[PDB]
């Protein structure tokens, strides 16, 4: 249950190993409950369960910020967080080429931008607000300057 996962996350200093099998088991329980749980109880319980899941995310992400190593089903979520941090550090240390709010990027996979086809190896200049999601999705990588 979610309350158990939140309670163990508060008491432990390290990030608890929440395996994917346990998450799939609890999601199956939620789906099965639709057969027996009334709509009134299910609606009120959704608020308290979503608040517990929200806290579980916050507690585990706080430990990631403090320096704890994340392991479990949500490791792919923490990896996205590390990409956000590395983009942040590269940007402030001048490793990127910025024109106003746009950034130079190298295309990794065939992509359609502004109704135009770009292929792997091409260079695209586009706002950071649109480049970073495409970086996380491995469609783009930022053009890097070696300031060392």
């Amino acid at each position: 249950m979610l309350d158990e996962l939140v309670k163990k996350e508060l008491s432990e200093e390290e990030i608890t190993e929440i395996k994917l099998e346990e998450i799939i088991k609890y999601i199956t329980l939620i789906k099965k409950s639709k057969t027996f749980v009334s709509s009134e109880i299910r609606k009120e319980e959704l608020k308290f369960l979503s608040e517990l899941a929200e806290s579980l995310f916050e507690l585990r992400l706080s430990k990631v910020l403090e320096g704890k190593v994340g392991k479990g089903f949500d490791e792919f979520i923490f990896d996205i967080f590390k990409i956000l941090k590395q983009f942040y550090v590269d940007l402030l240390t001048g490793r990127y080429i910025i024109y106003n709010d746009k950034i130079y990027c190298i295309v990794q996979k065939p992509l359609i931008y502004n109704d135009h086809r770009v292929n792997e190896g091409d260079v695209l200049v586009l706002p950071m607000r649109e480049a970073l999601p495409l970086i996380i999705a491995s469609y783009l990588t930022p053009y890097k300057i070696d300031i060392e």
């Binding site: 309350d3 939140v6 409950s33 009334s38 319980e45 916050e58 507690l59």
Partner: protein, 174 residues
């Protein structure tokens, strides 16, 4: 500073077990408790969120509610040894949730008596928080790990106590 853990503690208190005397038959289910069947004249243990729903429907009644007399008694016992840091009144983990529910019901009624009783309860709780924080911070500054004292702290107070202990040890141990 500890806003994330304070919310997590509060949201955990909505699932804490509460004593309830069932007054009307009712059978239902939830994700937490599964299929349950209640019966009149039988005390049962339910999560706090489910007990509040069943109390508003007059299905059952919550028994272990905090009162203004309990707050005045805690304040009195706290003033007897105001300068003694190791004289915290043992409150427990459910004290904060029961107080939050007490102020929630008074603010929901919106009666005139609920307003003046609320102001009197805030004045008592402000005196309780200040005195207990004086003792709790001093215990952290003195670095005294007493298992009996730690149990007497609420979850929120224990978090504050450990945060300042670790902050002093890290800053003046480095």
């Amino acid at each position: 500073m500890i806003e994330v853990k304070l919310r997590a503690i509060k949201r955990l208190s909505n699932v804490y077990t509460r004593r309830v005397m069932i007054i009307e038959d009712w059978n239902g289910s939830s994700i937490t408790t599964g299929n349950i069947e209640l019966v009149k004249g039988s005390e049962n243990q339910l999560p706090q969120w489910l007990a509040i729903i069943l109390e508003g429907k007059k299905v059952a009644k919550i028994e272990d509610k905090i009162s203004i007399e309990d707050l005045g008694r805690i304040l009195f016992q706290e003033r007897q040894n105001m300068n003694t840091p190791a004289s915290l009144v043992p409150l427990g983990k459910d004290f904060t949730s029961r107080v939050q529910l007490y102020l929630e019901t008074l603010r929901k009624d919106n009666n005139v008596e609920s307003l003046e009783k609320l102001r009197k309860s805030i004045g008592i709780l402000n005196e309780i928080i200040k005195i207990r924080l004086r003792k709790l911070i001093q215990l952290a500054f003195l670095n005294i790990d007493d298992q009996n004292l730690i149990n007497g702290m609420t979850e929120e107070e224990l978090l504050i106590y450990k945060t300042i202990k670790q902050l002093i040890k890290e800053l003046y141990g480095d």
